mmCIF file of C-alpha atoms and ligand atoms in Angstrom:
data_model
loop_
_atom_site.group_PDB
_atom_site.id
_atom_site.type_symbol
_atom_site.label_atom_id
_atom_site.label_comp_id
_atom_site.label_asym_id
_atom_site.label_seq_id
_atom_site.Cartn_x
_atom_site.Cartn_y
_atom_site.Cartn_z
ATOM 1 C CA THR A 1 -6.819 26.244 -10.629
ATOM 2 C CA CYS A 2 -4.090 25.332 -8.061
ATOM 3 C CA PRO A 3 -5.475 25.855 -4.594
ATOM 4 C CA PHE A 4 -3.634 28.151 -2.220
ATOM 5 C CA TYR A 5 -3.078 25.325 0.311
ATOM 6 C CA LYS A 6 -0.737 23.594 -2.302
ATOM 7 C CA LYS A 7 1.524 26.653 -2.641
ATOM 8 C CA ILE A 8 4.483 27.557 -0.347
ATOM 9 C CA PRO A 9 4.717 31.398 -0.032
ATOM 10 C CA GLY A 10 8.044 33.118 -0.589
ATOM 11 C CA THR A 11 9.128 30.334 -2.824
ATOM 12 C CA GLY A 12 8.534 29.028 -6.268
ATOM 13 C CA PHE A 13 7.473 25.687 -4.695
ATOM 14 C CA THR A 14 4.331 23.575 -4.841
ATOM 15 C CA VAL A 15 3.379 20.409 -2.923
ATOM 16 C CA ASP A 16 1.376 17.542 -4.434
ATOM 17 C CA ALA A 17 0.232 19.791 -7.380
ATOM 18 C CA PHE A 18 0.708 17.744 -10.549
ATOM 19 C CA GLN A 19 -2.810 17.902 -12.052
ATOM 20 C CA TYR A 20 -3.066 21.648 -12.969
ATOM 21 C CA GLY A 21 -0.623 21.648 -15.885
ATOM 22 C CA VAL A 22 2.133 24.227 -15.603
ATOM 23 C CA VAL A 23 1.666 26.207 -12.418
ATOM 24 C CA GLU A 24 2.683 29.790 -13.152
ATOM 25 C CA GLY A 25 5.801 30.573 -11.214
ATOM 26 C CA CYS A 26 6.665 27.007 -10.051
ATOM 27 C CA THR A 27 10.356 26.145 -10.187
ATOM 28 C CA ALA A 28 10.240 22.869 -8.122
ATOM 29 C CA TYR A 29 7.319 20.384 -7.622
ATOM 30 C CA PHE A 30 7.571 18.350 -4.384
ATOM 31 C CA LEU A 31 5.706 15.016 -4.005
ATOM 32 C CA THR A 32 5.088 13.850 -0.373
ATOM 33 C CA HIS A 33 4.188 10.171 -1.223
ATOM 34 C CA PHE A 34 3.088 7.774 -3.920
ATOM 35 C CA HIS A 35 -0.736 7.835 -3.483
ATOM 36 C CA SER A 36 -2.794 8.584 -6.586
ATOM 37 C CA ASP A 37 -4.751 11.705 -5.343
ATOM 38 C CA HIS A 38 -1.238 13.206 -4.612
ATOM 39 C CA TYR A 39 0.696 12.217 -7.804
ATOM 40 C CA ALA A 40 -2.358 12.626 -10.075
ATOM 41 C CA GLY A 41 -1.109 14.021 -13.345
ATOM 42 C CA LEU A 42 2.525 12.751 -13.331
ATOM 43 C CA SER A 43 3.733 10.582 -16.315
ATOM 44 C CA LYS A 44 6.812 9.959 -18.636
ATOM 45 C CA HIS A 45 6.051 13.330 -20.353
ATOM 46 C CA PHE A 46 6.716 15.449 -17.247
ATOM 47 C CA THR A 47 9.704 17.856 -17.749
ATOM 48 C CA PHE A 48 10.000 19.788 -14.408
ATOM 49 C CA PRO A 49 12.132 18.924 -11.359
ATOM 50 C CA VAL A 50 10.371 16.530 -8.837
ATOM 51 C CA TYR A 51 11.757 16.420 -5.313
ATOM 52 C CA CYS A 52 10.843 13.406 -3.159
ATOM 53 C CA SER A 53 12.172 10.550 -1.068
ATOM 54 C CA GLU A 54 14.320 7.696 -2.525
ATOM 55 C CA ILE A 55 11.415 5.244 -2.313
ATOM 56 C CA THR A 56 8.908 7.609 -4.011
ATOM 57 C CA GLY A 57 11.542 8.223 -6.704
ATOM 58 C CA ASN A 58 11.852 4.359 -7.304
ATOM 59 C CA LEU A 59 8.049 4.234 -7.846
ATOM 60 C CA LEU A 60 8.045 7.294 -10.192
ATOM 61 C CA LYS A 61 10.751 5.677 -12.406
ATOM 62 C CA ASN A 62 9.396 2.052 -12.368
ATOM 63 C CA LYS A 63 5.636 2.472 -12.190
ATOM 64 C CA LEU A 64 4.941 5.864 -13.858
ATOM 65 C CA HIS A 65 8.060 5.896 -16.169
ATOM 66 C CA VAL A 66 9.056 9.437 -15.240
ATOM 67 C CA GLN A 67 12.497 10.051 -16.759
ATOM 68 C CA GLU A 68 15.420 9.831 -14.433
ATOM 69 C CA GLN A 69 16.761 13.318 -15.260
ATOM 70 C CA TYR A 70 13.621 14.968 -13.618
ATOM 71 C CA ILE A 71 13.673 12.820 -10.424
ATOM 72 C CA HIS A 72 15.520 14.384 -7.494
ATOM 73 C CA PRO A 73 15.556 12.044 -4.477
ATOM 74 C CA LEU A 74 16.627 13.466 -1.109
ATOM 75 C CA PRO A 75 17.831 11.676 2.033
ATOM 76 C CA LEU A 76 15.787 11.993 5.183
ATOM 77 C CA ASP A 77 16.804 13.985 8.258
ATOM 78 C CA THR A 78 19.371 15.997 6.254
ATOM 79 C CA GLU A 79 19.601 19.780 5.589
ATOM 80 C CA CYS A 80 19.451 20.193 1.764
ATOM 81 C CA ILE A 81 19.448 23.356 -0.459
ATOM 82 C CA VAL A 82 16.840 23.398 -3.254
ATOM 83 C CA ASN A 83 16.817 26.436 -5.626
ATOM 84 C CA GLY A 84 18.359 28.502 -2.898
ATOM 85 C CA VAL A 85 16.080 27.426 -0.015
ATOM 86 C CA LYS A 86 17.032 25.094 2.928
ATOM 87 C CA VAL A 87 14.611 22.081 3.229
ATOM 88 C CA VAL A 88 14.464 18.857 5.330
ATOM 89 C CA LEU A 89 12.409 15.691 4.622
ATOM 90 C CA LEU A 90 11.076 13.824 7.719
ATOM 91 C CA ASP A 91 9.386 10.441 8.001
ATOM 92 C CA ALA A 92 5.635 10.946 8.012
ATOM 93 C CA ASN A 93 4.624 7.481 9.477
ATOM 94 C CA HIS A 94 2.125 7.036 6.580
ATOM 95 C CA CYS A 95 3.012 4.593 3.710
ATOM 96 C CA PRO A 96 6.533 3.629 2.474
ATOM 97 C CA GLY A 97 8.504 6.600 1.295
ATOM 98 C CA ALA A 98 6.002 9.179 2.731
ATOM 99 C CA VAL A 99 7.539 12.414 4.030
ATOM 100 C CA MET A 100 6.777 15.685 5.813
ATOM 101 C CA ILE A 101 8.721 18.709 4.479
ATOM 102 C CA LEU A 102 10.330 21.552 6.518
ATOM 103 C CA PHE A 103 10.929 24.773 4.561
ATOM 104 C CA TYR A 104 13.258 27.499 5.950
ATOM 105 C CA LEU A 105 12.187 30.705 4.119
ATOM 106 C CA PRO A 106 14.740 33.407 3.327
ATOM 107 C CA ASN A 107 12.746 35.853 5.516
ATOM 108 C CA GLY A 108 13.112 33.577 8.654
ATOM 109 C CA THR A 109 9.686 31.934 8.550
ATOM 110 C CA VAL A 110 9.689 28.152 9.066
ATOM 111 C CA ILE A 111 6.841 26.077 7.445
ATOM 112 C CA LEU A 112 6.013 22.365 8.047
ATOM 113 C CA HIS A 113 3.923 20.539 5.443
ATOM 114 C CA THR A 114 2.857 17.196 6.910
ATOM 115 C CA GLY A 115 1.739 15.626 3.661
ATOM 116 C CA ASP A 116 -0.352 12.638 4.815
ATOM 117 C CA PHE A 117 0.792 11.521 8.312
ATOM 118 C CA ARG A 118 -0.021 9.518 11.415
ATOM 119 C CA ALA A 119 1.209 11.745 14.260
ATOM 120 C CA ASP A 120 3.443 10.021 16.794
ATOM 121 C CA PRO A 121 5.282 11.187 19.969
ATOM 122 C CA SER A 122 8.555 10.067 18.278
ATOM 123 C CA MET A 123 8.189 13.116 16.021
ATOM 124 C CA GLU A 124 8.715 15.328 19.122
ATOM 125 C CA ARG A 125 12.439 14.152 19.032
ATOM 126 C CA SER A 126 13.184 14.619 15.344
ATOM 127 C CA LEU A 127 14.775 17.784 13.853
ATOM 128 C CA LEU A 128 11.463 19.446 14.579
ATOM 129 C CA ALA A 129 12.430 19.914 18.243
ATOM 130 C CA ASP A 130 15.295 22.301 17.208
ATOM 131 C CA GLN A 131 13.436 25.486 16.156
ATOM 132 C CA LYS A 132 10.044 27.169 16.053
ATOM 133 C CA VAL A 133 7.528 26.416 13.224
ATOM 134 C CA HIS A 134 5.350 29.342 12.318
ATOM 135 C CA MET A 135 2.954 27.825 9.758
ATOM 136 C CA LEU A 136 1.598 24.188 9.613
ATOM 137 C CA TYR A 137 -0.002 22.646 6.453
ATOM 138 C CA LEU A 138 -1.881 19.853 8.295
ATOM 139 C CA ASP A 139 -3.391 16.440 7.262
ATOM 140 C CA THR A 140 -6.839 16.903 8.839
ATOM 141 C CA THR A 141 -8.395 13.622 7.483
ATOM 142 C CA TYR A 142 -9.713 12.566 10.951
ATOM 143 C CA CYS A 143 -10.084 16.005 12.653
ATOM 144 C CA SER A 144 -13.225 15.207 14.752
ATOM 145 C CA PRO A 145 -13.436 13.604 18.211
ATOM 146 C CA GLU A 146 -15.462 10.580 17.062
ATOM 147 C CA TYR A 147 -12.376 9.299 15.282
ATOM 148 C CA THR A 148 -10.664 6.941 17.736
ATOM 149 C CA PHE A 149 -8.778 3.906 16.697
ATOM 150 C CA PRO A 150 -6.378 1.401 18.205
ATOM 151 C CA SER A 151 -2.633 1.362 17.793
ATOM 152 C CA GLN A 152 -1.225 -0.326 14.679
ATOM 153 C CA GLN A 153 0.485 -2.803 17.061
ATOM 154 C CA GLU A 154 -2.878 -3.832 18.645
ATOM 155 C CA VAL A 155 -4.446 -4.343 15.259
ATOM 156 C CA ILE A 156 -1.562 -6.502 13.954
ATOM 157 C CA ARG A 157 -1.645 -8.633 17.139
ATOM 158 C CA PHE A 158 -5.377 -9.309 16.488
ATOM 159 C CA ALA A 159 -4.817 -10.209 12.839
ATOM 160 C CA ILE A 160 -1.838 -12.535 13.588
ATOM 161 C CA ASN A 161 -3.754 -14.406 16.411
ATOM 162 C CA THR A 162 -6.943 -14.712 14.250
ATOM 163 C CA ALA A 163 -5.156 -16.099 11.194
ATOM 164 C CA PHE A 164 -2.879 -18.515 13.150
ATOM 165 C CA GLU A 165 -5.849 -19.993 15.083
ATOM 166 C CA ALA A 166 -7.940 -20.420 11.834
ATOM 167 C CA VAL A 167 -5.257 -22.108 9.760
ATOM 168 C CA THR A 168 -4.150 -24.359 12.645
ATOM 169 C CA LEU A 169 -7.785 -25.528 13.134
ATOM 170 C CA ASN A 170 -8.159 -25.971 9.296
ATOM 171 C CA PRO A 171 -4.923 -26.515 7.254
ATOM 172 C CA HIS A 172 -6.963 -26.225 4.062
ATOM 173 C CA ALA A 173 -8.022 -22.590 4.812
ATOM 174 C CA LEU A 174 -6.650 -19.786 2.572
ATOM 175 C CA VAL A 175 -5.951 -16.263 3.897
ATOM 176 C CA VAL A 176 -6.678 -13.357 1.530
ATOM 177 C CA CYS A 177 -5.788 -9.671 2.116
ATOM 178 C CA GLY A 178 -7.090 -6.701 0.079
ATOM 179 C CA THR A 179 -4.985 -3.791 -1.307
ATOM 180 C CA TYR A 180 -5.420 -0.836 -3.756
ATOM 181 C CA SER A 181 -2.337 1.231 -3.075
ATOM 182 C CA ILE A 182 0.936 1.095 -1.229
ATOM 183 C CA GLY A 183 0.635 1.184 2.576
ATOM 184 C CA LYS A 184 -0.468 -1.265 5.274
ATOM 185 C CA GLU A 185 2.128 -3.882 4.175
ATOM 186 C CA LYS A 186 2.553 -4.940 7.879
ATOM 187 C CA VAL A 187 -0.929 -6.534 7.743
ATOM 188 C CA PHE A 188 -0.142 -9.196 5.059
ATOM 189 C CA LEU A 189 3.569 -9.555 6.032
ATOM 190 C CA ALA A 190 2.853 -10.205 9.725
ATOM 191 C CA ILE A 191 0.166 -12.815 8.840
ATOM 192 C CA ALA A 192 2.421 -14.602 6.272
ATOM 193 C CA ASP A 193 5.271 -14.651 8.817
ATOM 194 C CA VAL A 194 3.228 -16.391 11.531
ATOM 195 C CA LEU A 195 2.032 -18.957 8.923
ATOM 196 C CA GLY A 196 5.539 -19.690 7.483
ATOM 197 C CA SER A 197 4.398 -18.719 3.996
ATOM 198 C CA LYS A 198 5.467 -15.994 1.498
ATOM 199 C CA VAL A 199 2.729 -13.773 0.279
ATOM 200 C CA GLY A 200 1.544 -14.372 -3.229
ATOM 201 C CA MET A 201 0.403 -11.629 -5.581
ATOM 202 C CA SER A 202 0.136 -10.416 -9.133
ATOM 203 C CA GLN A 203 3.165 -9.448 -11.181
ATOM 204 C CA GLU A 204 2.056 -5.714 -11.017
ATOM 205 C CA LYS A 205 1.853 -5.716 -7.204
ATOM 206 C CA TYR A 206 5.139 -7.644 -6.805
ATOM 207 C CA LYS A 207 6.911 -5.016 -8.961
ATOM 208 C CA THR A 208 5.401 -2.242 -6.732
ATOM 209 C CA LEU A 209 6.653 -3.946 -3.587
ATOM 210 C CA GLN A 210 10.161 -4.462 -5.009
ATOM 211 C CA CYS A 211 10.491 -0.575 -5.110
ATOM 212 C CA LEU A 212 10.037 -0.088 -1.336
ATOM 213 C CA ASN A 213 13.501 -0.945 0.150
ATOM 214 C CA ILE A 214 11.939 -3.386 2.624
ATOM 215 C CA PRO A 215 14.800 -5.504 4.100
ATOM 216 C CA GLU A 216 14.967 -9.211 3.073
ATOM 217 C CA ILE A 217 11.905 -8.680 0.803
ATOM 218 C CA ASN A 218 12.993 -11.525 -1.548
ATOM 219 C CA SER A 219 12.484 -13.913 1.430
ATOM 220 C CA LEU A 220 8.878 -12.628 2.074
ATOM 221 C CA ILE A 221 6.944 -12.282 -1.237
ATOM 222 C CA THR A 222 6.343 -14.234 -4.501
ATOM 223 C CA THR A 223 4.448 -14.376 -7.787
ATOM 224 C CA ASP A 224 3.869 -18.117 -7.405
ATOM 225 C CA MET A 225 0.293 -18.285 -6.030
ATOM 226 C CA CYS A 226 0.204 -22.070 -5.766
ATOM 227 C CA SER A 227 3.148 -22.171 -3.321
ATOM 228 C CA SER A 228 1.527 -19.507 -1.093
ATOM 229 C CA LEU A 229 -1.316 -19.640 1.450
ATOM 230 C CA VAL A 230 -1.580 -15.801 1.940
ATOM 231 C CA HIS A 231 -2.920 -14.185 -1.254
ATOM 232 C CA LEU A 232 -3.227 -10.462 -2.020
ATOM 233 C CA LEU A 233 -6.064 -9.313 -4.250
ATOM 234 C CA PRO A 234 -7.515 -5.996 -5.342
ATOM 235 C CA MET A 235 -9.684 -4.531 -2.587
ATOM 236 C CA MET A 236 -12.583 -4.644 -5.112
ATOM 237 C CA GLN A 237 -12.426 -8.456 -5.159
ATOM 238 C CA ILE A 238 -12.829 -8.670 -1.268
ATOM 239 C CA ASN A 239 -16.503 -9.645 -1.125
ATOM 240 C CA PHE A 240 -18.398 -12.984 -1.209
ATOM 241 C CA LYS A 241 -18.800 -13.102 -5.057
ATOM 242 C CA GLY A 242 -15.135 -12.180 -5.696
ATOM 243 C CA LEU A 243 -13.874 -14.594 -3.035
ATOM 244 C CA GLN A 244 -16.051 -17.592 -4.084
ATOM 245 C CA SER A 245 -14.727 -16.954 -7.598
ATOM 246 C CA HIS A 246 -11.125 -16.779 -6.409
ATOM 247 C CA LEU A 247 -11.560 -20.053 -4.502
ATOM 248 C CA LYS A 248 -12.674 -21.863 -7.667
ATOM 249 C CA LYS A 249 -9.309 -20.755 -9.198
ATOM 250 C CA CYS A 250 -7.187 -22.628 -6.619
ATOM 251 C CA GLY A 251 -8.249 -26.073 -7.913
ATOM 252 C CA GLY A 252 -9.660 -27.563 -4.675
ATOM 253 C CA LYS A 253 -6.388 -26.842 -2.808
ATOM 254 C CA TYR A 254 -8.537 -24.945 -0.254
ATOM 255 C CA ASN A 255 -12.039 -25.322 1.243
ATOM 256 C CA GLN A 256 -12.306 -22.112 3.374
ATOM 257 C CA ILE A 257 -11.291 -18.390 2.997
ATOM 258 C CA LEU A 258 -10.529 -16.059 5.827
ATOM 259 C CA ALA A 259 -10.181 -12.494 4.421
ATOM 260 C CA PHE A 260 -8.981 -9.126 5.796
ATOM 261 C CA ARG A 261 -10.181 -5.665 4.603
ATOM 262 C CA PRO A 262 -7.866 -3.050 6.239
ATOM 263 C CA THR A 263 -10.183 -0.085 6.269
ATOM 264 C CA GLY A 264 -9.587 3.387 7.681
ATOM 265 C CA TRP A 265 -12.230 4.374 10.210
ATOM 266 C CA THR A 266 -15.685 2.771 10.184
ATOM 267 C CA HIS A 267 -18.578 3.716 12.707
ATOM 268 C CA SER A 268 -18.241 0.389 14.667
ATOM 269 C CA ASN A 269 -15.093 2.205 16.159
ATOM 270 C CA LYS A 270 -17.482 4.343 18.278
ATOM 271 C CA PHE A 271 -18.912 1.269 20.094
ATOM 272 C CA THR A 272 -16.696 -1.801 19.808
ATOM 273 C CA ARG A 273 -13.085 -2.644 20.943
ATOM 274 C CA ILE A 274 -10.497 -4.581 18.814
ATOM 275 C CA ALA A 275 -10.793 -7.707 21.021
ATOM 276 C CA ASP A 276 -14.574 -7.798 20.198
ATOM 277 C CA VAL A 277 -14.548 -7.458 16.308
ATOM 278 C CA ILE A 278 -16.526 -10.069 14.317
ATOM 279 C CA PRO A 279 -16.555 -11.059 10.624
ATOM 280 C CA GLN A 280 -19.245 -11.172 7.949
ATOM 281 C CA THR A 281 -19.773 -14.863 7.034
ATOM 282 C CA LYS A 282 -21.451 -16.678 4.132
ATOM 283 C CA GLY A 283 -20.786 -20.364 3.961
ATOM 284 C CA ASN A 284 -17.083 -21.216 4.056
ATOM 285 C CA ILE A 285 -16.047 -17.474 3.554
ATOM 286 C CA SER A 286 -15.404 -14.969 6.427
ATOM 287 C CA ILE A 287 -14.443 -11.252 5.904
ATOM 288 C CA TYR A 288 -12.900 -9.180 8.709
ATOM 289 C CA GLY A 289 -12.801 -5.322 8.479
ATOM 290 C CA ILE A 290 -9.817 -4.307 10.688
ATOM 291 C CA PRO A 291 -9.223 -0.608 11.581
ATOM 292 C CA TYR A 292 -5.590 -0.294 10.525
ATOM 293 C CA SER A 293 -5.026 3.485 9.995
ATOM 294 C CA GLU A 294 -2.112 5.327 8.403
ATOM 295 C CA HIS A 295 -3.614 8.731 9.402
ATOM 296 C CA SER A 296 -3.680 10.480 12.806
ATOM 297 C CA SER A 297 -6.552 9.807 15.182
ATOM 298 C CA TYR A 298 -8.162 13.009 16.578
ATOM 299 C CA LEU A 299 -6.215 12.678 19.881
ATOM 300 C CA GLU A 300 -2.841 11.953 18.106
ATOM 301 C CA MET A 301 -3.383 15.042 15.863
ATOM 302 C CA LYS A 302 -4.339 17.223 18.826
ATOM 303 C CA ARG A 303 -1.249 16.126 20.852
ATOM 304 C CA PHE A 304 1.132 16.883 17.903
ATOM 305 C CA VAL A 305 -0.321 20.309 17.246
ATOM 306 C CA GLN A 306 -0.387 21.304 21.023
ATOM 307 C CA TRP A 307 3.311 20.241 21.163
ATOM 308 C CA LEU A 308 4.308 22.153 18.032
ATOM 309 C CA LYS A 309 2.368 25.370 18.883
ATOM 310 C CA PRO A 310 2.159 26.769 15.359
ATOM 311 C CA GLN A 311 1.086 30.452 14.741
ATOM 312 C CA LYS A 312 -1.141 29.496 11.826
ATOM 313 C CA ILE A 313 -2.748 26.148 10.653
ATOM 314 C CA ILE A 314 -3.683 25.519 6.979
ATOM 315 C CA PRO A 315 -5.799 22.325 6.511
ATOM 316 C CA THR A 316 -5.100 20.180 3.416
ATOM 317 C CA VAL A 317 -7.991 17.658 3.881
ATOM 318 C CA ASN A 318 -11.793 18.120 4.091
ATOM 319 C CA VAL A 319 -11.423 21.710 2.793
ATOM 320 C CA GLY A 320 -14.221 21.453 0.222
ATOM 321 C CA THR A 321 -17.234 22.411 2.433
ATOM 322 C CA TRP A 322 -17.907 25.414 4.597
ATOM 323 C CA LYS A 323 -19.252 23.177 7.389
ATOM 324 C CA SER A 324 -16.008 21.125 7.492
ATOM 325 C CA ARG A 325 -13.822 24.218 7.366
ATOM 326 C CA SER A 326 -15.751 25.859 10.246
ATOM 327 C CA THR A 327 -15.665 22.692 12.375
ATOM 328 C CA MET A 328 -11.908 22.359 11.989
ATOM 329 C CA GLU A 329 -11.246 26.045 12.820
ATOM 330 C CA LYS A 330 -13.291 25.573 16.084
ATOM 331 C CA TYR A 331 -11.089 22.647 17.149
ATOM 332 C CA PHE A 332 -7.893 24.550 16.329
ATOM 333 C CA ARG A 333 -9.046 27.436 18.632
ATOM 334 C CA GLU A 334 -10.019 25.050 21.434
ATOM 335 C CA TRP A 335 -6.550 23.508 21.273
ATOM 336 C CA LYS A 336 -4.770 26.867 21.307
ATOM 337 C CA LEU A 337 -6.837 28.135 24.295
ATOM 338 C CA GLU A 338 -6.352 24.912 26.291
ATOM 339 C CA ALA A 339 -2.563 24.906 25.733
ATOM 340 C CA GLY A 340 -2.047 28.707 25.892
ATOM 341 C CA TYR A 341 -0.136 29.508 22.696
HETATM 342 NI NI1 NI B 401 -1.965 9.064 1.432
#
């Protein structure tokens, strides 16, 4: 059944709750972003109102074939009334089109639902600065102090420098980047830009990217693989067997592959810096795991929450085990006692 952490009290609303059939008493289904664990269950047969960003609404229409009459896109940073309740969508700094949602309940309670987010100090100067938030539905993916990672900017600088050096030493090297969802587009776009190439990909992935309102996108991507020296492949194909295979397909146009796997966190984060990362190599193939995250680090999460000073925190991630739930509740109390709210 629909878990309590997907329901917004005092409303008929639910958040990211499309896989339970009809939820009894739901008058509006919000969708924070187009990732499959969140939209799971949506299709062309859905006949309830879906509230979301413009970009998520482009993906619902074009990729899932949800009918236009049930898609209600809202602008960001704008007070909107939905079924009698004032709401605001804020950028979540996750993937394209991802939002946080502010609900202003008739009784005076204010609720923030972060969806999936990567906390940033810039959020401290959004419409959130303007009133008190009583309850926080929090993306707790990385809520443990071991989870450190570099800035997105640091990681992109590493990738750009690595790729440019490799291709300038060997003009017959191919760059490949893995993907299995929207998000992390800066990785492959920044590398293709430094190399003066467009990125080449499948027709399915090109169609996905043409939904994202990225400026000048026609200048940056293509379905013509042969004209491109940055290829995108399914993340599943980013291994020695899949890459050797792919290289056969290019007809001796290339003699070397340099590949990127943008992971979340991986335990080499606890020891090594970005400047010191090394690839796995077999023959003429090298695979780099780079820690490009679209979720808050522990310290970014902690800073956001100590700034916001909520009265109550409801985790939405890692809620399935008693050990995880207890661990998280201990950190929340530490933060509250340190900051004095
Ligand atoms: Ni997500």
